[PDB]
Amino acid sequence: LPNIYPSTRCKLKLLRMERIKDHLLLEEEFVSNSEILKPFEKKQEEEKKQLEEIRGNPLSIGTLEEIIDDDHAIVTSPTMPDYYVSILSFVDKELLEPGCSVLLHHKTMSIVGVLQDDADPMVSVMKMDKSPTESYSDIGGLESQIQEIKESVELPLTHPELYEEMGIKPPKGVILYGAPGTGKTLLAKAVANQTSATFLRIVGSELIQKYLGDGPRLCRQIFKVAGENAPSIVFIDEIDAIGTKRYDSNSGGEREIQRTMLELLNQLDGFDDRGDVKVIMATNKIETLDPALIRPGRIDRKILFENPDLSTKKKILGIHTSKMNLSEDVNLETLVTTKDDLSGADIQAMCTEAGLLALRERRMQVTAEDFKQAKERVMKNKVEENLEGLYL
């Protein structure tokens, strides 16, 4: 069924669903007449009866292993001795991918259907199923970075006309390197908000597995799942985790991490020539990354993130305190807009702390004293810096 315009009541709207019913009844009449003309003894719904009786019951479940001499196959059920099952006509010979789940017949054990996986026991967590929240309005400033990320990841998907006319393949990947707590994750949430593509997030820690084998296995599975659900906006985050840390649970140690990184650097570029799989990584330490990953042709536009300036600080204060039960005594102009160094995370942290403190007193309105107390609270809970002493 199609969509319906307009939203409100209108005679033309009634005409539209009148056309809908007219065409629907006309399809129904055509199908009825066609069926009645057909020889029911081999037509109508007797095909369902024949399919059910030939299929037999119950249909067992096994695993396909080969398609040699089509109309023949070697299934391998977990308990059966790997029969030489023949392939029937009802099954579609295009979904019989070696390694699928076929439906053997109970007694004669002839394939009478392919059971699609449709499980996604782990991907369901990965697959973005509900847009997080924040749109691009919630990001204060950062206009250049937003423009770059848009023209790299959004425009190729929503508006390919500019790129195909211009004759350039879109920039493959983007890495968001910058100082910690500066919106590198927020911008990913924003691009996930407005999207017509699947958004499979992954964090670099999860690629540091425990067993030797399941280091490249996970990456291969992730990129295969991204490929089949094209297009994909895979968001490998904390990509520096593979380099540092050196987890004890990792059995291989450094070597297994190296193999996993090699598999990643292949799957990003590949001999396989994957389709529309955009890659967006973000990290705090761009330094400790093997330059194979960040090489052009794998991730082209390396967007730099920088701590906000005074105007950006005041814009962040305005956007974050927009949903405030603020008393007039609070002055946003001198609130945190002090030029004594802040970050994109501090401005929200002090707001959260002040809101919690106001909740503690059960004051539904926010006082300037509470905002100042949360300001100093955030200031003390801050590892200041180290390299400034060189230039101090």
Binding site: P2, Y5, P6, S7, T8, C10, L12, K13, R16, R19, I20, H23, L24, L26, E27, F30, V31, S34, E35, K38, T158, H159, E161, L162, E164, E165
Partner: protein, 244 residues
């Protein structure tokens, strides 16, 4: 008849599907053409997949009709996806030279005029280009027996009668093109909305002449350069409004 309101278009898609389900072999080799004429110059996603399904089917004439329906469906849009499908079919239907010839004709029609011209039957404001529909019907009437036009291929130039450019051109008052920002996005109807809602969704701030595909309108981003014609398609003339 269904080639009017797009709701009739979408219903006719299912109509042709059902008829293809229960149809005799003479009517089998037109359901592709039925999709093509109905969905010309707008390569919608749900149109060409069933056409691809029927392209690998038997009744070689059905396959020829399916690929020609692709060609009509992708008329001038330069759709790389449908171009890849057509190239794949060229690889497959290479033994039968007639299929190869009609495949190459569909390839040529796919990228007609390098993408600056289309077979669109009905333009903005739903005017009817009777010449374009006449040409399409002329090329589709007798191709239930495609061997006829394989013999007499001179009628394949009939598309040149209903062919037209598809572009914007901000002509100055004197009669010369002038650069101006043109807002291009997906068309939306103004029926139930109140006030002054926008007629464009997903705007692109594009400059002077662009190529708006089937399903997009145009509107002047700049406050100045007042267009005498409200419907910004085809040739457009502008005047300098003194404001700003």
């Amino acid at each position: 008849i269904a080639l009017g309101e797009d709701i009739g278009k979408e219903m006719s898609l299912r109509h042709f599907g059902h008829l293809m389900h229960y149809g005799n072999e003479h009517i089998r080799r037109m359901v592709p053409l039925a999709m093509g004429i109905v969905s010309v110059s707008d390569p919608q996603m749900k149109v060409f997949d069933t056409l691809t399904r029927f392209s690998h089917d038997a009744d070689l004439e059905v396959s020829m009709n399916s690929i020609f329906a692709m060609g009509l469906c992708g008329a001038g849009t330069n759709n790389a996806r449908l171009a890849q499908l057509l190239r794949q079919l060229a690889s497959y239907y290479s033994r039968e030279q007639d299929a190869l010839f009609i495949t190459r004709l569909a390839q040529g029609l796919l990228h007609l005029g390098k993408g600056t011209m289309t077979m669109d039957v009905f333009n903005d404001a739903h005017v009817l280009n009777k010449v374009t529909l006449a040409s399409i019907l002329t090329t589709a009437v007798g191709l239930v027996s495609p061997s006829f036009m394989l013999k007499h291929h001179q009628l394949f130039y009939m598309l040149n009668a209903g062919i037209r450019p598809k572009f914007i051109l901000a002509l100055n008052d004197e009669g010369e093109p002038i650069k101006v920002n043109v807002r291009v996005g997906q068309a939306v109807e103004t029926v139930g909305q109140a006030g002054r809602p926008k007629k464009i969704t997903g705007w692109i701030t594009q400059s002077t002449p662009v190529l708006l595909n089937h399903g997009e309108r145009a509107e002047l981003e700049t406050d100045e350069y007042i267009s005498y014609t409200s419907h910004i398609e085809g040739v457009v003339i502008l005047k300098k409004n003194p404001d700003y």
